[PDB]
C-alpha cells in the first residue's frame, strides 16, 4: 500500500520534530505548481545511520504501512529517496500538533483530556489487536487533529510480538515511561505499554507543565548524585511502590484508574480493551 509520491513535486516548508534516528518535516506536494497544493508530513531517516537503524526503519514503514483506524495517523504513501537510500514515509498533516507542544499554551477542561485518553486507548487496542507494541507512548506522540481528535502519530519503536509469545526482548529508551519488568527483565508485554498509558495519562491530567513531568518528578526522587545507576534507582522506587503524584484538581477516580495502570504486577493491570468502556463512561460523566 499504496500511493508513490514524486520528490519533485514536494516543497519543504518546515520541521515538525526529530524522533529516533528520523526528521519529520511538513512539505507542500505541488503538482500543479499552484499552492493547490496538499500538506504531509513527511518522516525521513537521519543524515546518517547503521544497519540497525536500517532495518528498524524498513520494519516502521511496514508497520504503519498495514495500520488503518480512526485515531492512527492516516499513512498516505512512500518517496523515493536516493539520497539517503531508503523511502520517505509520507503521512497527514495534523496543524495542531502534538498534546506536548499544544496542552501547555492551551487550557483544556478535563472532559476533553478524558476524551483525548479514550481515544488513545481505542486505537492502542486496535495496534494490540494486530499484534504491535507500541513502546513509545508519550503525549509528544499523540497528535491533536482537533478539538474532539486525537491521533496516536508515531510507531519508531514499535514492534511485533513473535505470534508464540507474550512480550518482545529489548540507549534511547524513555526510561521514565517504562514499568518494572521493562527496566529490569527488559521483556516487553502489552501489559507494558499500558503502565506508559498511565504516565501519559498523568501528562494530560498536568497539561504536560514541563517541572510537573516524569523525568523531572522521578530526577527528584532519585536525585542526580550518581548518573551511572539512574534506571536501577527508578527500579528500586517503583517496586517500593512510589507513584507519580495526583495532578492538581484530578478527581479521585481518575488517579485510581492511573494507579491500575501502574500495578507492578503486569497481569493486575487492565487491558486496553477494558479502558475503553471504564473512559467513555467517565468521559460521559464529566460533561454533565
Ligand atoms: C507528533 C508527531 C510524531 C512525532 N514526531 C516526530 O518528529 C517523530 C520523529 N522523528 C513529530 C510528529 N509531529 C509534530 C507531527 N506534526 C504534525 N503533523 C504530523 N503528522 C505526522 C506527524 C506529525
Partial sequence: ????????????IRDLGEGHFGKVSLYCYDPTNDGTGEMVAVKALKADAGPQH??????????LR???????????GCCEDAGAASLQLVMEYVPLGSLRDYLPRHSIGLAQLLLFAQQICEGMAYLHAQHYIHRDLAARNVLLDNDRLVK???????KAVPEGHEYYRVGDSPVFWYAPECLKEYKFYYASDVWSFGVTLYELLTHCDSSQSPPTKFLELIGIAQGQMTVLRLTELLERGERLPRPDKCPAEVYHLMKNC????????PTFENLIPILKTVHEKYQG
Fill in 54 to 63: 536500517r532495518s528498524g526503519w524498513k520494519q516502521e514503514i511496514d508497520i
Fill in 262 to 269: 501502574w500495578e507492578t504486577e503486569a497481569s493486575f493491570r
Fill in 1 to 12: 500500500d499504496p500511493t508513490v509520491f514524486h520528490k519533485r513535486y514536494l516543497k519543504k
Fill in 66 to 76: 498495514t495500520l488503518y483506524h480512526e485515531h492512527i495517523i492516516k499513512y498516505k
Fill in 152 to 158: 496516536i502519530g508515531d510507531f519508531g519503536l514499535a
